[PDB]
């Protein structure tokens, strides 16, 4: 029908962003790039977390934010969060570079277009 592949374009855009800004990011097998700025003293799939994240586009425009702690079940979130959050502990800080297939997909939603790369700055304050 209208099946659109964005994996190569998303990877190229993420690499170009990590080149323009002097950032070194680890890459998972699913195509997600993450930078662990700090850690704590590990949330699982069946775990509630509190976050102070901020999510924007490659141009810096913020599409989502929570300046106050918000609680999530970590099973209801996008796959990028599902594989990025368990990589640190309470008090840790991460920067995710989620591609579309791990974000909001090829169709997207309102205020997030299809095939878009999302950058998340997530602070994990609690793992309970």
């Amino acid at each position: 029908d209208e099946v659109k592949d964005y994996t190569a374009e998303n990877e190229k855009e993420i690499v170009d962003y990590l080149a323009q800004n002097n950032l070194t990011a680890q890459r998972t097998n699913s195509g997600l790039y993450y930078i662990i700025t700090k850690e704590g003293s590990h949330p699982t799939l069946n775990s509630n977390i509190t976050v102070i994240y901020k999510g924007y586009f490659t141009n810096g425009k913020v599409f989502d934010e929570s300046t106050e702690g918000v609680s999530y079940s970590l099973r209801t979130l996008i796959p990028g969060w599902k594989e990025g959050i368990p990589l640190l502990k309470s008090g840790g800080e991460i920067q995710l570079f989620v591609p579309a297939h791990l974000g909001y997909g090829s169709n997207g939603n309102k205020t997030v277009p299809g095939g878009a790369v999302l950058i998340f700055e997530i602070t994990l304050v609690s793992v309970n």
């Binding site: 099973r75 979130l77 205020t111």
Partner: protein, 96 residues
């Protein structure tokens, strides 16, 4: 289902029909005692969403799945109705 529409709403209505046929009065029914004869058929079908609404859970937050692990839907409704009526399916009205 491989090519049918996955949209909630429809743009083009499909026509419903009413058919009347007084066409047997002139073949041989003059001498078959028939002083009247007609056939009638009717079909009317509708697809109705009594109440749809936008979903607040369909937002920009990272939370995308509900308690049933289903993706949130932008437009949510409680019921869908498919009503079909043959009124009549067939009506034969004649007089000898």
């Amino acid at each position: 289902a491989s090519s049918s529409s996955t949209n909630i709403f429809r743009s083009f209505p499909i026509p419903n029909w009413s058919i009347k046929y007084n066409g047997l009065m002139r073949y041989k029914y003059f001498k078959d005692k028939f002083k009247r004869f007609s056939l009638q058929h009717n079909y009317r079908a509708s697809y109705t969403i009594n109440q749809f609404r936008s979903n607040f859970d369909y937002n920009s937050s990272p939370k995308v799945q509900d308690v049933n692990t289903n993706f949130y839907n932008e437009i949510i409704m409680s019921n869908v109705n498919l009503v079909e009526q043959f009124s009549p399916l067939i009506r034969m009205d004649f007089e000898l």
